[PDB]
């Protein structure tokens, strides 16, 4: 079934992308099922809440004493070679934490990499209802 594996932070990149050492390899990982507002990509600009989603992820992974990587059941890497996973910082899923704060939307739902979809949809509806950030 799904299993959590250890990883080590090298550097946070932005809201949904973090570089980690995973089984001795530096790899960058893209957070499954979420999309945060983009900081720097000229083809969208800096969207509202981009600095804030990036600050949230940075803080959460840099202060964690234990980072874990949990891959889903389909593809492990996307077309850019990034690892696709659920990242947990001290047992808390970062992908859910950003959606619960209204700093990410549930996006890019590619079957069968969707085991936590319902869990994430539940947090997003609670953040919309609370008119948090992206929803305010
Ligand atoms: C989250 C995710 C993104 N991607 C791809 C879709 C997008 O491709 P394109 O670049 O063609 O738009 C891109 C979005 O990533 P970012 O949101 O980091 O830009 O990464 C996947 O292929 N699978 C995934 O599960
Ligand atoms: Co994006």
* Method by which the model was determined: X-ray
- Nearest-atom index, ligand 1, CA of 79: 22
- Nearest-atom index, ligand 1, CA of 80: 20
Q: How many CB atoms lie within 10 A of CB 87?
A: 28
Residues 6+ apart with CB under 8 A from 94: 31, 57, 60, 61, 87, 88
Residues 6+ apart with CB under 8 A from 110: 74, 75
DSSP 21: E
Our count of domains for the chain comes to 1
The alpha helices in the chain, defined as continuous H runs, are: 50-63, 94-100, 117-129
Contact 31, 56 (CB under 8 A): no
Residue 46 C-beta-side C-alpha neighbours within 13 Å: 9
Closest CA relative to residue 9, chosen from 58, 79, 71: 58
Domain boundaries, position 11:
1-136
Contact 113, 84 (CB under 8 A): yes
CA distances from 92 to 44, 47, 87, 129 (A): 30, 26, 8, 22
Residue 16 labeled ligand binder: yes
Tokens 């720097």, located at residue: 40
Q: What's the CATH number where 16 sits?
A: 2.40.50.90
State this model's resolution in angstroms: 1.7
The torsion defined by the Cα of 68, 74, 78 and 79, in degrees rounded to 10, comes to: 160
């Amino acid at each position: 079934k799904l299993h959590k594996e250890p990883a080590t932070l090298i550097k946070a990149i932005d809201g949904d992308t973090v570089k980690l050492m995973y089984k001795g390899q530096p790899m960058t990982f893209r957070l499954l099922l979420v999309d945060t507002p983009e900081t720097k990509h000229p083809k969208k600009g800096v969207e509202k809440y981009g600095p804030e989603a990036s600050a949230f992820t940075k803080k959460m992974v840099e202060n964690a004493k234990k980072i874990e990587v949990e891959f889903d059941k389909g593809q492990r890497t996307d077309k850019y070679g990034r690892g696709l996973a659920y990242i947990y910082a001290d047992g808390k899923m970062v992908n859910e934490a950003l959606v619960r704060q209204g700093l990410a939307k549930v996006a890019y739902v590619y079957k069968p990499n969707n085991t936590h979809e319902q869990h994430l949809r539940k947090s997003e509806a609670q953040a919309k209802k609370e008119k948090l950030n992206i929803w305010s």
